[PDB]
Amino acid sequence: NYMSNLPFGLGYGDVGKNHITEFPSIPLPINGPITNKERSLAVKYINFGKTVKDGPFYTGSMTNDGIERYSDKYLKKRKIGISIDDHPYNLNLFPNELYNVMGI
Amino acid sequence: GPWFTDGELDIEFINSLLTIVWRFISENTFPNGFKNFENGPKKNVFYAPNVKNYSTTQEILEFITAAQVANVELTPSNIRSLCEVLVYDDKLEKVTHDCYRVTLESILQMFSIFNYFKMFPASKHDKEVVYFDEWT
Amino acid sequence: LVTPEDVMTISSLEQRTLNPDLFLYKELVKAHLGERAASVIGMLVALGRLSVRELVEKIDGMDVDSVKTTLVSLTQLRCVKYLQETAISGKKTTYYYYNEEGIHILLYSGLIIDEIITQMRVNDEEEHKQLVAEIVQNVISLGSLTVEDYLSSVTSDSMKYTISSLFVQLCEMGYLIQISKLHYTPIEDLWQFLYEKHYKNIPRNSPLSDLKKRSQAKMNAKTDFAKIINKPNELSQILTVDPKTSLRIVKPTVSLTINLDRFMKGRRSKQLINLAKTRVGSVTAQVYKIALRLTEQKSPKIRDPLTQTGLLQDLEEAKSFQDEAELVEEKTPGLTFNAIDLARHLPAELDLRGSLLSRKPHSASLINSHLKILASSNFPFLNETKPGVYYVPYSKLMPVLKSSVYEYVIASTLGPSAMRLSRCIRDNKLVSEKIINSTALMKEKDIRSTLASLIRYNSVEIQEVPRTADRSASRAVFLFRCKETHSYNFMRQNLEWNMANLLFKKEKLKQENSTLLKKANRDDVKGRENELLLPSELNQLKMVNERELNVFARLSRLLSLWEVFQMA
């Protein structure tokens, strides 16, 4: 009746609970102490990515009132972004279908 | 042999045998053994390639006979079995003619993967911790 | 008892079903470029080959212009490969791959510029460090950075003279390689394009049979493909031109893009140096750091010369490619160096006086002694062809290096008896239930406990021994096997998935801290963060900043683990 299949090395107390640990736990030693070089790697890492996001290479974006406040008149523009076509590139490395988006 | 005993493999006994075979090789291979590593990594001396710094099975057998640490005579095949058992665990290297060498045993005993005893876990309830078994 | 609502939010179960190859690159593009770019790259990874119309009909972004802009951004970022295969009976449309090695540029960016900074012979000047860091950062963030753009950018001539001075050096190290058509097309498609012309160049009715024409076609294809890959892999034709009464100049017209091959050669040399530091005391380990430093610059291809990814390896007489790889390894005379060659590049800090003891000042004889111990050491660091000159081999060092690093990662994960059983099953081929006891001699209880804990991974293989014709493993005793290939396969997947988990954690922290991060990364705010900030908010900012620093440190510490399994 499937209740009597027990190896001699296996007891009765352990079985029945099951349910496993929610996440398997093996502390990896790659989380050691930080040094000045590691902090510098982190700093240069955060400068990177930030540079490419403050640059023109976002292509990620998917108060919008049809009426303009007088405060919005003679007010500073947010930022005149350099368009993807505005920055020069090499035609020999881009496909023909990608030429139209660029400014020839 | 003595390894077979009461149907058990003598946990405290075989462990004690495995920790005496490589110790002599650590004090017989280097010019000063392990005290050459006590002045620092930047002051140890190494033997010339031509010298025969390797250890043969006859000298190890003489050690294990004169030491009287196990109270049991050992066959040469038995000593070969012991050193085959302990060739693992990063203890002794295999080179031809049954010879042994240690490279990082002292560093182990006292990212640079091949030694993690200088790198401790996160040891905090924080997040971002990595686990090797999280994927399975 | 944990609730099913409690898991899958703090447990990350739903991230365990993403394939790490797709998850990692998707997360990287999410972090760096944007969500449209990441969606495009994810569609390219899931569907290896597809056109633009496939993107239009698969991604919710049903727009030609938007897909065009995102795809051109990814192509500029060297994250996409393209091809134009022509259908003769009608109109041709170009297809699109995804660049694998290109995404490592943004990924390895920190290690890239770090090795750039620490690799120069002259680094003690702070201004030069900042200049080289900024120039390589601009090149990896922009892709194909060009002289006609940067020289026009710089507003003073004397700082423009240094920019051209650094370019020739940086190309000679190979850090700036000339981009071309060879960097956007798949290897198998190049091999096929060089295999179908030669099947078409043979006139009819020749006395040779199909086998002989196939052999001649394939050897001619191999030779011309090798020439076409050798021409741009290492060249100085852009640096060759010299105007009158002026210094050596590169072509300003050409676009200079950062390479990865020589940098990753340097990274492999660096990991071998750390291995030596862990293996051998610092007295003669110091000489090994610069020992590999004079071969790493012109080092051979690490894993595949790209003649093993574009075609089936071999069916009959399959050893030829290993034979030719080792043939090149021994036939290259430039890589081999003598002790006189090494003495000209040894730093003044190292003395090499007490590094030897014959019995129980930059002298080439003593350097020769270290070189001999290296060649005769248990790990094949060097092999001796002629007395006094040797070389670094890779036909017999890669398997032992992979076995050592893999097995020691198992060492770092599991316990001592698990390490013992791993070593035993590695060294002793085809172990069994009695052979483990005969070759182990420790406690069977922990032996099989750690064994069962280790069955989970791809470390060991299980076999079935049928006592009868029909196969039941519960009727008869079964033995083990090694199959190290699957073990090496696991270390890829697990490490990349853990990486992708790191980037998911950091990007989710960014998604929940975006307002504070935007307030931080403002020009006037930058450098002034202890005055115009409320107490609790600024303290929280310090906590989240240090949390991101910790995640970056963990990322970098993990970044020394996957490339060593990224070899052949």
Curated annotation (Swiss-Prot), chain A:
Q: Where in the cell is it found?
A: Nucleus
Query: Which top-level group of life is the source organism from?
Result: Eukaryota
Quaternary context:
Component of the RNA polymerase III (Pol III) complex consisting of 17 subunits.
| Extra remark | The acidic domain is essential for its function.
Which family is it part of? Belongs to the eukaryotic RPC7 RNA polymerase subunit family.
Give the protein's biological function: DNA-dependent RNA polymerase catalyzes the transcription of DNA into RNA using the four ribonucleoside triphosphates as substrates. Specific peripheric component of RNA polymerase III which synthesizes small RNAs, such as 5S rRNA and tRNAs. C31 is involved in the formation of the initiation complex.
Q: What is this protein called?
A: DNA-directed RNA polymerase III subunit RPC7
Origin species: Saccharomyces cerevisiae (strain ATCC 204508 / S288c)
Instruction: Supply the gene name.
Output: RPC31
Swiss-Prot record, chain B:
Q: What portion of the full-length protein is represented by this chain?
A: 162 to 316 of 317
Q: Record's family? A: Belongs to the eukaryotic RPC34/RPC39 RNA polymerase subunit family.
Instruction: Indicate where this protein is primarily found.
Output: nucleus
Protein species of origin = Saccharomyces cerevisiae (strain ATCC 204508 / S288c)
Q: Which GO terms describe its cellular component?
A: cytoplasm; mitochondrion; nucleoplasm; nucleus; RNA polymerase III complex
**What does the function comment of this entry state?**
DNA-dependent RNA polymerase catalyzes the transcription of DNA into RNA using the four ribonucleoside triphosphates as substrates. Specific peripheric component of RNA polymerase III which synthesizes small RNAs, such as 5S rRNA and tRNAs. Involved in recruitment of Pol III to the preinitiation complex. Involved in the configuration of an initiation-competent form of RNA polymerase.
Query: Which key words are in the record?
Result: DNA-directed RNA polymerase, Nucleus, Transcription
Q: From the Swiss-Prot or TrEMBL record, give the protein name.
A: DNA-directed RNA polymerase III subunit RPC6
Subunit and partners: Component of the RNA polymerase III (Pol III) complex consisting of 17 subunits. Interacts with BRF1/TDS4.
Q: Where is this protein found?
A: Nucleus
User: Which GO BP terms, alphabetically?
Assistant: termination of RNA polymerase III transcription; transcription by RNA polymerase III; transcription initiation at RNA polymerase III promoter; tRNA transcription by RNA polymerase III
From Swiss-Prot, chain C:
Principal localization reads: cytoplasm
Q: What does this protein do?
A: DNA-dependent RNA polymerase catalyzes the transcription of DNA into RNA using the four ribonucleoside triphosphates as substrates. Specific core component of RNA polymerase III which synthesizes small RNAs, such as 5S rRNA and tRNAs.
Compartments it resides in:
Cytoplasm; Nucleus
User: What is this protein called in UniProt?
Assistant: DNA-directed RNA polymerase III subunit RPC3
- List the keywords (alphabetical): Cytoplasm, DNA-directed RNA polymerase, Nucleus, Phosphoprotein, Transcription, Zinc
Q: Pfam families this protein is in?
A: HTH_9, POLR3C_WHD, RNA_pol_Rpc82, RPC3_helical
Recorded GO molecular functions are: single-stranded DNA binding
Q: Where is this region: Leucine-zipper?
A: 495-516
What's an example GO BP annotation here?
tRNA transcription by RNA polymerase III
At which residues is Phosphothreonine found?
Answer: 3
| SUBUNIT field | Component of the RNA polymerase III (Pol III) complex consisting of 17 subunits.
Please give the family membership noted in the entry.
Belongs to the eukaryotic RPC3/POLR3C RNA polymerase subunit family.
* Gene3D superfamilies recorded: Winged helix-like DNA-binding domain superfamily/Winged helix DNA-binding domain (1.10.10.10)
Q: Which GO terms describe its cellular component?
A: cytoplasm; nucleoplasm; nucleus; RNA polymerase III complex
Give me the gene this protein comes from.
RPC82
The misc remark on file is:
Present with 2520 molecules/cell in log phase SD medium.
Keyword hit for Ion transport: no
